[PDB]
Amino acid sequence: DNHVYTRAAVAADAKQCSKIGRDALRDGGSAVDAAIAALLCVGLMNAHSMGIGGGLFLTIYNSTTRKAEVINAREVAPRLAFATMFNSSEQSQKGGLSVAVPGEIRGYELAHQRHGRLPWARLFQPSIQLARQGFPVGKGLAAALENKRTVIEQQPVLCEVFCRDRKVLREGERLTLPQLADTYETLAIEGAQAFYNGSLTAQIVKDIQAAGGIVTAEDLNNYRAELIEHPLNISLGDAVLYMPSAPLSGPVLALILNILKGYNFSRESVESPEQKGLTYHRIVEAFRFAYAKRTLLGDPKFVDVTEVVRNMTSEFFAAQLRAQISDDTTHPISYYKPEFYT
């Protein structure tokens, strides 16, 4: 109604999934239970965006211990991948070779082992129903289907679920996901191992290879979600902000905010057109300085990023960049000193 709630809240990109997370909370689930239940649902209602074929990060705060952690369940390059595997955007964007090893389900499993309070099966139940029963296509999916209408209509296996009368579904029209329903059911009952080292595994490998990919059973067997006890943080006034470091973009966010905090923004910063305009100019320039550094980032297990990240989260270093923001002009690319090698 108002969306101010006395006790608990779930904010997802589909109403039904916000509700499904809310119901898990109401039935005694932790924040993690609610997030998993909602995510299983978003994987259906916003299938273009995310799902069990993908990967995720969770930033988790425990109010008891007052500790934050991060769960890294992002996809990884298969063991057979190599630097020069692609020769055009087309090759890296479409078909099996574009597929990295999915981490989603191992990510749910780890977050659930550490923080769950409802049974695993209970998390999938509402989404199994939804996928079998069907749901009206929401605003977001409809626009994504419209955007990709050509590619979807010419591929029969996608059109099988995403079309009606050989044309992409529109908003309000019913979407059913009968195979995902079965798959979700298998996951609910057999657990995470069903995906990585169990009854779904050989079919996964065969689907990726049929489409030209190189993921093998061993890639699946070997996938691991990772617990990070010490996320990135930055201090802002009397508050701390927890966010994931590389390979995610916490260090960029940290740098944007640390640059901007030295201007002491407040309601006044946007009260008149003169102030507002200068304020937004400053924001954009902080974006530009923050991105200069970004191209030195990569997976910290393969790239040494400790120095880069240390700079990006340092208030002193941010103060040095803030002093180079001219209030009366933006600058050319080289002014921000983007770097491509250390």
């Binding site: 609610a34 995510l39 390059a77």
Partner: protein, 189 residues
């Protein structure tokens, strides 16, 4: 990419961003399992592929077996000195996730916008390369003028910039917002 924010009754919280990368990922659906596979390989940099006009390959983000590609995602939790959660926030929607997340935080923490306004407020984006400031359709045009007179070349996003889900502690309890750009809505008790 989709973003989800949760606060439970005990004050614990989750910020969760999940993705198959581009819309419908690889466009490979299993006819048997119905799984739709990611195209996360495309988040790697590649020496052959020309990314943008003038944009070089970044060797830190080349493909290696067992390597994870760089990502714009940034699921974030803000905790006050007293140990209570102040904000749970993150974004989805491509290259503009990190700047949209920054803007949501700036809007609420500094400009004093309530969470729904912070989510709905017009956004803008610049990432250095390419060398252009994108603004949303309904941005205050005094901002557009302030950028242009300071020599930014601005352009208007033809759709929208990112998708933000957020929760913020208030006097009234936990205030939640889902981004109308995608059509979501919060739920709680």
């Amino acid at each position: 990419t989709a973003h989800l924010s949760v606060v439970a009754e005990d004050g614990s919280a989750v910020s969760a961003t999940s993705t198959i990368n581009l819309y419908f990922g690889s466009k490979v659906r299993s006819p048997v399992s119905g799984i739709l596979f990611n195209n996360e390989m495309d988040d790697f940099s590649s020496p052959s592929i020309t990314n943008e006009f003038g944009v070089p390959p970044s060797p830190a983000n080349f493909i290696q077996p067992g390597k994870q590609p760089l990502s714009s995602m940034c699921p974030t939790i803000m905790v006050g000195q007293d140990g209570q959660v102040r904000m749970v926030v993150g974004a989805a929607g491509g290259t503009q996730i990190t700047t949209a997340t920054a803007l949501a935080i700036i809007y609420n923490l500094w400009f004093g916008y309530d969470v729904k306004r912070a989510v709905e407020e017009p956004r803008l984006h610049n990432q250095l390369l390419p060398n252009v400031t994108t603004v949303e359709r309904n941005i205050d045009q005094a901002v557009t003028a302030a950028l242009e007179t300071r020599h930014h070349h601005t352009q208007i996003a033809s759709t929208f910039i990112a998708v933000v889900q957020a929760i913020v502690r208030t006097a009234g309890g936990w205030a939640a917002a889902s981004d109308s750009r995608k059509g979501g809505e919060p739920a709680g008790y």
